Structure formats: C-alpha cells, structure tokens
Amino acid sequence: KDGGSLIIGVTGDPEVINPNYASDRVTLTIQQAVYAPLFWEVDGKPALAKSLDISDDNLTYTVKLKDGLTWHDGKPLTADDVVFTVNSILDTKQNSPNRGNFVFDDKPVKVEAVDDTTVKFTLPTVAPAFENTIKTFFPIPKHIFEGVENIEKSDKNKNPIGSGPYKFVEYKTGEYVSLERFNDYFDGKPKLDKVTFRITKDQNAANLALQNGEINLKSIQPSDRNKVEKASAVNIITYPENRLSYATFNENQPALKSKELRQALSYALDREEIIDAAYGSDEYAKPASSFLTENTKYFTDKVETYDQDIAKAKKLVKESGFDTSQKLTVYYLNNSKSQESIALYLQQQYKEIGVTLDLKPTDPNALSNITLDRKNADYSIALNGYIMGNDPDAYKSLYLSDAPYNYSNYHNKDLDALWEKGAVTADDKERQEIYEKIQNTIADDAVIYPISYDNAVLALDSRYGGQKAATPQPVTMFRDLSKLYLTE
C-alpha cells in the first residue's frame, strides 16, 4: 500500500516553471506540484508558513516559517529565500508580472529576515490587499538564483528546484514532464512515487487515453462528461473554478453609451436558459449576479440582476433612441461551443425586442488584438471570462477608466475614487461598504452582463483515493497531489 505512478493529462507545453513568472494554466498546474506556497490560497491555511501576524497600525506583516524546511537539493529553506524572492520581484530589470503587488504609490514594501524562521514586511502605507499577496506567494531559492541577471531566461529553470511534494526529473518537449516524490515534503511524505504530466491536445484522443488507463487524471469539458463517465471506471469531480462568464457592452460605440439600451439588453435575457444552452445542464455553472465571484471578499448577490422582462426591455430600447435600423455585433472565440451557443441565444433574444445582432466569431489571436485595444469600436458586445482571486482590489484593471482590461470602455471618475478608497481602507466593515457600492454601481449602470459562475470538471481513475484531502481547486486541478494514493 505505497508508491505507484500517476499520469495527468494537460493540453499544452509549459512555459517557464518559476513562480515569479508563471501565469498560464499548464505552467501553474506543474508549479503547484513542484513549489509550495507560504499559505494555501484556496483557504488561507498555513503551508510553508506557520503563521501571519498583522500589526495594529496595519503597516507591519510578520510571517513565521516552519522549522527544518528544505529545498529539493537539501539546502535549508529560510526567511533569506523569502527576502530574496521579494527583492527579485521588486527588481525592475527582472520584468516580474507580479511586481505591482509589492509596490504602493511607487514605493516598495520593505522586507527583512529577523531570523531564519521570521520574515517582517513593512508597508509604506496601509494596504489590506497585501494579506492576499502574502497568501498567494511561492518562494524561490536564493542559493540557485542569487547573481542571475535574467531569471526568466536562465537555463536553471530547465531543472527547477522547489519545495513542493514532487521533484523535477525531466522534460521532453511536446510530450511530457516527469517528477518524483520529495520525501522531506513539509506536509508529509507523498504516497504516490511518480507523477507524469502527459501533453495531449485532442480531447477525443485524450479521453480515449483515459479510458485505456494511459492517463489517470485530467480536466473534462462539460459536453464530454457523459462519454467518459460510462466509458471506464472514473470518478467525476465538479467544483467551482471561480470563473465569471460575462458579456461586455462596448461604450466606444455611441449607441451603447445609453444606460437604457444596456439595461434593455440585460432584461431580454434569462440566466438559467443561457446556462442550459451553453453547457448541458446546471451542474456546470450557476447564475451570476455580482461582477465579483463568490470566493472574493465582500461578494454579495444582492445587486440588480435585470431578471427577464421582454416587455420592459421593449420599453427601454424605445426610450433609448436607438434606431433598430442599425445592427449590433457580438464578438467571441471561434473555437468555443459554449460561446457560440451564448451568442445565438443573445441573437435570438435581441431579435424578440426589435434589435438585430450579427454574430462575428473570431480567431483567438485576432480577438486579443481587437479587445485588448482600448480605442476599438468594432465590437458592440464581447463574450469573456475571468478568474481574479480573493481580494476585490485585483478587479480594478477591468473597471478603472484607464485600465487595459476595461473591455466595456466605461469611464466613471466617482467610481474610480471608490476603487482607490477601498484599496487604502483597513477597517473591515468600512471596506465592506465600499465594495458593496462598487458592486451596486456596476450592476445599476449595466456595465456588463454577468452570466454565470462556472465550474470545472475532473475525471480521476477510480483506483485512486484521497481526492477530498488533495482538494480540487481552480486552475491546477488539485491543491496537493501528495494526498492522492493508488489502491491496487
């Protein structure tokens, strides 16, 4: 009752396996197995860290580490690694995408190693969201990257040294990544001996590999769930992915400047029907309300949702002054059955309120160029989605007037003052009231149409136990693979 191998199916090649840069699904999935964080994001529980303590004035965060931690090569893991990691992110020449989380009004957070097991962070001004940044932090090893000028390109990333439950063995380009258990893993010796990440793009082929035991674990698309469940002995696991599926209204098009038109295009829709048409049933998504997902602090479902009222929708499109003669465009991904079904539903529903909608499915690259361009007015509506994290401050880049991901091109100075005010307010209840108003203003102005909070689906070979303990979670499938075990 020990050892065994686990083969996990992923869709593409990883990029740089280094937590200072990892951002795509595959790289993060592999990183979760190789590197341990200070705290586990999904629940804020202690991981490499034993505890976090915040001073009364909210400027000093003290993190205590567990004793006797080591990296995969046997070197100790101490505060010096934490300090080094933060300084390597702060260092502008390294181009770390998370640098913004350690800077406030252009001033960096100061970090210091009081002892080998004590890290002290001193903020320049109050910043409640910094607790979240600490809870999503994976340290890198100082003895490996100290004196490296370009960390992202370093060949040392070819054989990543980590603190996670699985040590790196090798990487065959376009084929697989193999790992082996780390016996001194802080949370206990892993039960499975080897873990291989198998790269297979075609889902029909991947699902067949799963059926024949060539793959033991992978993500499944909703439309394939009944196929794989009856094909072999597998347990299907469904859990929230903290993803919001939504439609944006492009205010660069003059007609969509009208609050009335945006509200008409909300009242014409029904969430249970969209979910029903997009995914097969309601097991894969639940109706959204707020622009925030349920995992995010201060989430509230008590916002305006524009429940289906076609008669009232007709009233609003009239009051709008929109000349129905004109036609609207919905831009979405040309390789997503969900997005096409959602599009047809909007077309269908808008037809019924006297509005003509033209479907404009597009190539992914082309879609980025279109929607990532803040001056673009080609699209009337764009279907999108996001997984933003546990603190609402991270959502600013999607709703500030100047933000690069403000797809709706909504410009409201007063709302922007609330966003900034929320970022600097320490009192919990006063901070709750601010994000409630933000949720209320976005819903009241029908800036977007939140469709659903989506679930992800995994298929795990029935011979494997411990899925509860491994914790299914957004993006990486599981929180900790060292809890899985093979029952042969």
The span from the CA of 449 to the CA of 184, in Å, is 48
CATH superfamily of the 243-453 domain: Dipeptide-binding Protein; Domain 3 (3.10.105.10)
Long-range contacts of 350-353 (CB under 8 A, 24+ apart): 350/265, 350/268, 352/268, 352/310, 353/264, 353/268, 353/310, 353/313, 353/314, 353/317
Q: How many secondary structure helices (H) and strands (E) does the chain include?
A: 15, 21
Q: Is 221 in contact with 361 (CB distance < 8 Å)?
A: no
Chain breaks in the chain (C to N over 2.5 A) after: none
Nearest to 46 by CA among 114, 137, 161: 137
Reported in sequence order, the residue ranges of 221-372 that DSSP labels E, i.e. its strands, are: 234-249, 285-287, 327-333, 356-362
Nearest to 408 by CA among 274, 242, 291, 286: 291
Q: Which two tokens stand for residue 156?
A: 């040392």
Which residue bears the tokens 């258990």?
181
The span from the CA of 81 to the CA of 8, in Å, is 30
Domain 4-34+152-242+454-488 - what CATH class?
alpha beta
Could you give phi then psi for residue 222, rounded to 5 degrees?
-45, -45
How many CB atoms are closer than 10 A to CB 470?
19
Q: Is 182 in contact with 190 (CB distance < 8 Å)?
A: yes
Q: 369 CB contacts (<8 Å, ≥6 apart)?
A: none
The span from the CA of 102 to the CA of 273, in Å, is 43
Domain 35-151, what architecture? Alpha-Beta Complex (3.90)
Q: Is 109 in contact with 86 (CB distance < 8 Å)?
A: yes
Bridge partners, 286 (sequence order): 453
Nearest to 260 by CA among 311, 314, 319, 306: 319
CA atoms within 13 A on the CB side of 292: 25
Q: Is 476 in contact with 244 (CB distance < 8 Å)?
A: no
Q: Is 360 in contact with 370 (CB distance < 8 Å)?
A: no
Could you give phi then psi for residue 251, rounded to 5 degrees?
-70, -5
Give the DSSP per-residue string, 23-87. -SHHHHHHHHHH---SB-TTT--BSSEEEEEE-TTS-EEEEEEPTT-B-TTS-B--HHHHHHHHH
Give the DSSP per-residue string, 79-128. HHHHHHHHHHHH-GGG--TTGGGGEETTEEPEEEEEETTEEEEE-SS--T
Q: Which two tokens stand for residue 152?
A: 């992202």
> Domain ranges in the chain?
4-34+152-242+454-488, 35-151, 243-453
Please name the amino acid found at residue 195.
Answer: V
DSSP 132: H
The span from the CA of 48 to the CA of 25, in Å, is 23
